[model samples]
Target: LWHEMWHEGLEEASRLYFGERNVKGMFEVLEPLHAMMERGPQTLKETSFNQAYGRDLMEAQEWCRKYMKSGNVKDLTQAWDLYYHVFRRISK
Candidate 1:
């Protein structure tokens, strides 16, 4: 399960990192990872997002779901990654 989760995460991260042309494809790639992250074993402390800025985990997950369901290819970009460069642009 851990291996599966890791692979899905890697694939989704890759699609997002590479600016893939298929948001639906990327979301399909990420769905398992999202499910794993959502339902997998985690401590209460581990689930906290106190340090998270901009969008939180729930928002990120919702975005993924929308992308998955809508088949919107344009939204899949490098900005989906956790350490996206856009944050720097926004902060500046």
Candidate 2:
């Protein structure tokens, strides 16, 4: 259910902002962090990209984890925070 909504928003975000909806391809690039976000802090330890990318994203990771635990709309802002990173990567 969460994954479904995530992808739906991904699809719309692509079409709306990017003028394209290459959801699968976008998701491929996002999968590493996306998986970590879905799984939790434990997966954070198991994942290497976060470290490779930088520690700054740890904040966003924590926000995502917070959303998972609390289901708070404010915390879900991290979802778009992560998504915006993906957009910037693909923007060029």
Candidate 3:
């Protein structure tokens, strides 16, 4: 089922984001974006870059909150989708 696939994808994404480090949850997964924004814009690209990422980061945070409160698998899956996108961008 797709749930198995999503769980696998989530694990891989967690590996990419966390390496061997311990991650408490999606909230921990999102910490990188905050650091990136806190470092401030490095160039013209980052000005818009931060804005776009920040937008998604906020949405992801909301999704994480929903996951936390409702304990909904779908909420976490949505958060993972955004987390992967942000991870790819930040890694690039």
- Which RMSD values do the candidates have, in order? 6.6, 9.2, 9.0
lDDT-superior candidate, 1 or 2: 2
Cα lDDT for residue 88, model 1?
35
Please provide, for model 3 over 1-92, each residue's C-alpha lDDT reduced to its tens digit, 9 standing for 90 to 100.
22223234445647754575333543454454444456665677667666766677667768877866897668867876886786665546
1 or 3, greater by TM-score: 3
Model 2 over residues 1-92: C-alpha lDDT tens digits?
33334445555654643465343454354446455454543454335433433343455556656766796757646555766564454334
What is the Å distance of residue 54 in model 2 from its true position? 3.5
lDDT of each: 0.47, 0.50, 0.59
Which candidate, 2 or 3, has the higher lDDT? 3
In candidate 2, clashing pairs total 0
Residue pairs in collision within model 3: none
Question: lDDT per residue, candidate 1, 1-92, as tens digits?
Answer: 44334444555666654665554555566556546555534554333322332244345556555656666634433236542432333335
How does candidate 3 fare on TM-score? 0.55
In order of lDDT, best first, we have 3, 2, 1
